[PDB]
Design a protein around this nucleic acid. Structure first.
Length: 103
RNA sequence: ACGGAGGGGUACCACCAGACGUGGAGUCUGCGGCUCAAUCUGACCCAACGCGCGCACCUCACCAGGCCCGGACGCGCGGAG
């Protein structure tokens, strides 16, 4: 029960994905929560960020695939529905924050 | 329709009587030719030739050289590792 909120956020592009963008967003201290991958080949992309976040409010969804489409990042038809095309993200960061029910 | 046919009319883009001119020289401008990398093109009796409303840039088309995509919208694939 959390998908309901993200839909409006992405319309203002609050959700941010990617290793080179997530890093910089948190280091500026302007983030509310962050997410991870169920797994990944190298800890570095996982265990490097986790300390940088603990040292400087985390979750983890066992489905790393939900993290892709939940953050837009999806191709759909011009007629609604969708292509069933999803890029598998790995981390996202909420800036504006513009959920509260779940926490 | 035409007539080096006839008969009636008419007009300074026709004449009579006159006036002022051009074609003479220098020069402005436009037109064909020569040259050039280019010397962008239309128009050729009246009914083409300061006419297509003033060309150092734009205008600008032609000559020698270089940036940009500003490839709408649909299908397939790829993409935030």
């Amino acid at each position: 029960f959390l998908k309901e909120t993200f839909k409006r956020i992405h319309n203002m592009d609050g959700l941010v994905t990617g290793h080179r963008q997530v890093f910089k967003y948190l280091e500026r201290k302007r983030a509310k929560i962050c997410f991870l991958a169920s797994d990944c080949e190298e800890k570095q992309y996982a265990d490097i960020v986790e300390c940088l976040c603990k040292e400087y409010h985390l979750c983890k969804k066992f489905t790393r695939r939900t993290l892709g489409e939940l953050t837009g990042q999806v191709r759909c038809l011009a007629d609604s529905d969708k292509i069933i095309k999803v890029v598998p993200a790995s981390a996202c960061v909420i800036h504006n924050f513009v959920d509260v029910d779940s926490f």
